[PDB]
C-alpha cells in the first residue's frame, strides 16, 4: 500500500507562508500529514517551536477565540482526520533546526526512556497515529548557522555513538508504540527522515537495522544542489544526468534509493522526496557541460552577499534576507510563488532535462538559474515509485503548494496523489477515541405549583490534569475538555419541553431530545473538574426515572465539525 506524505510546518499560519491554515490542506489526497516540528530539550522534555500555533490560534474557525483550548493546529489536525478518514496524522520531532538535543537523549537509557514516555503521552492526547523522527543528522558534527536561522541548534554534540544510539532510540519508540497501540486499540506507525547522500548515511544511519524497525522512511531527496556550491545543478532530480560533475554524482532520487537498497533497505518502506520550492544561483555561465541542457552544471559567479555579508553565488529568495531569519541567499521561492520569481528575475526560460527528468529555469543572458519540482517531475517520481515497488512520496511542504480551483493548496498534492493512486478515493480507516470520564445524575424535582414537571440533571467532567511542562499540560488540558457537548436523552412517554441555563437549548431530533452546549458560551468548553447542573422542563410531573431510557453525549471540536466520541453516561 502506497503512501502520500506531507509536511505542514507550524509556521505555515503566519504571513511568511501566506497565513495558510490546516483547513485548507487537501487532506482527502494524503495518507499521512506530519506536524513539523516538535522540539525537545536534553532532558527529554518536549518543547514547542510555536506554542500559539500549536494550541491557541483560531485558524480561521469562526467560533474560536484566540487561546480557547479547542484552538491550535493539533486540534485542527484531528478535525482534518474526522472530515477525511483516509488520513493518518502524526508529529515530526526535530528537523534540521531542532536536532541538537538528540545526541544527548539517545546516549543515556534513562533520558531515552523519558523522551519516549513523553512522546507516547503527546500522541495519546492529540490522538495522533504516528511518530516521525527527523534527526538531521546523527554522527554529523554541525554548528548552528545563526545567519540562516537564529533558532537553529545545529548538531554540535554529534558523535560516533549516534549511529548505534539512534537504533536504540527507534527500538524503544517502536516497542512503546506497539504497547500503547494495544492498550488503546489502534495501529501506530514509526517513520524517520533520512539523508540522501552516502557520507551522511555512513556517519549515522545503520541502514539495515533502521529499516527493520521503522514502518517507513522518508528520504530527503531534495536540497541536493544549491548556493553552497558554485556549480549549478538539480536539487531534487529523479535521475543523475550522466554529465553531472563528481560533487553531484550520487545526489538523485535513483542513486540514493539504489544505495539504500544496496545497504539493506527494504524497498516497500522507501518514501521519496519532492520539493515544493526552488533553489538557485544569480549568475551561471554556460560551460557546455551538457549541450542539451544550457546552463546546467555551469559555473555560478560569486556575485551576491548573504545578510551577514558573506559572498555567495546564490540568487535572492522570495522572502527578504534578514540576519537570523532567512539570511542566506539560496534562490528559494515557493512553488506557489513561481510567478513572483519570474517577475523579479525576468527573462527566465523553462527547460526540461530529459536525462534527469527534472525542470529548471534559466536566463541565458543574465545567468540566473533555478531548480525545482513541477507536475511532470512529480509524475515521473511517482512512476519510479510504482515500477520499483517503493513506498510512496513525501512533499516539503504543504503551504508552498499552489491553489487550483479553490482555497486549497493542492496543485502538486493532487498530481502526486493521482499519479500514485489514480482518481479513486483513498482507503478510509476507523477512528477511535478514548471516552472521557463523564458522569451524570438525574433527579425528579417535586413542584407543587404550576404545570408540567422538572428533571434536575447534573453532568460532571471527572477528568483531572496531571501532566507537567508546557507541551504535555496544554495537550492534556485540551484532551480532557469536553467540547461542544451534545446530550442525547431518550425517554419513554416523557416529553422534554424546555431547558434552562446552564443547559443549552433543547430540540427533538428523531427519538432523542438533544441539548446543545455549543450554544452556551460558558458551556461549550467544559474544563476538567467542572459540573453543569440544570433544570429540564417536562410536560408532566415525574415521580421516578423509570421512563428515562438513556443519556449519551457527543463532542465536536468546532460547532461546524463532526461529532465524535459519542458515549453513554446514564442507562436504565
Ligand atoms: O518567522 S516565521 O515564523 O515565519 C518562520 C520561523 N522559522 C524559520 C526557520 N524554519 C526552520 C525550518 S527547518 O530548518 O527546521 O526545516 C522554521 C520556522
Ligand atoms: O553481499 S552484498 O551486500 O554485496 C549484496 C546483498 N544484496 C543487496 C541487494 N539486495 C537486493 C534487494 S531487492 O532488490 O530484492 O529489494 C539483495 C542482497
Ligand atoms: Na532542542
Ligand atoms: Na534489510
Residue numbers in the entry: 25 to 596
What does the paper say about this structure?
C. perfringens type G, the causative agent of necrotic enteritis in broilers, produces two glycosyl hydrolase family 18 chitinases, ChiA and ChiB, which display distinct substrate preferences. Whereas ChiB preferentially processes linear substrates such as chitin, ChiA prefers larger and more branched substrates, such as carbohydrates presented by the chicken intestinal mucus. Here, we show via crystal structures of ChiA and ChiB in the apo and ligand-bound forms that the two enzymes display structural features that explain their substrate preferences providing a structural blueprint for further interrogation of their function and inhibition. We succeeded in obtaining several crystal structures of recombinant ChiA and ChiB in apo (unbound) and ligand-bound forms to resolutions between 1.30 Å and 1.85 Å. Both ChiA and ChiB encode for an N-terminal glycosyl hydrolase family 18 (GH18) Trios-phosphate Isomerase (TIM) barrel followed by a C-terminal putative carbohydrate binding domain (CBD).
When comparing the overall structures of the chitinases, the unexpected location of the ChiB CBD becomes apparent. As compared to ChiA and the Chromobacterium violaceum chitinase, the CBD of ChiB is located on the opposite side of the TIM barrel. This CBD-location of ChiB is similar to the one occupied by the Serratia marcescens ChiA CBD. The cleft of ChiB is covered by a loop of the TIM barrel leaving only the sides open to the solvent. As in ChiA, the sizeable substrate binding pocket of Apo ChiB contained a PIPES buffer molecule originating from the crystallization condition. The makeup of the binding pocket is conserved, except for the longer loop closing of the cleft and the entry of the cleft near the ChiB CBD. Neither differences should prohibit the binding of a linear chitin oligosaccharide. The active site motif is trapped in the resting conformation with a low-barrier hydrogen bond between D156 and D158. Indeed, ChiB was predicted to have a typical substrate-binding cleft of subfamily A chitinases, suggested to facilitate the hydrolysis of oligosaccharide dimers from the polysaccharide chains such as chitin, by “sliding” the substrate through the substrate-binding cleft. Overall, ChiB displays the hallmarks of a chitinase processing chitin from its reducing end towards the non-reducing end.
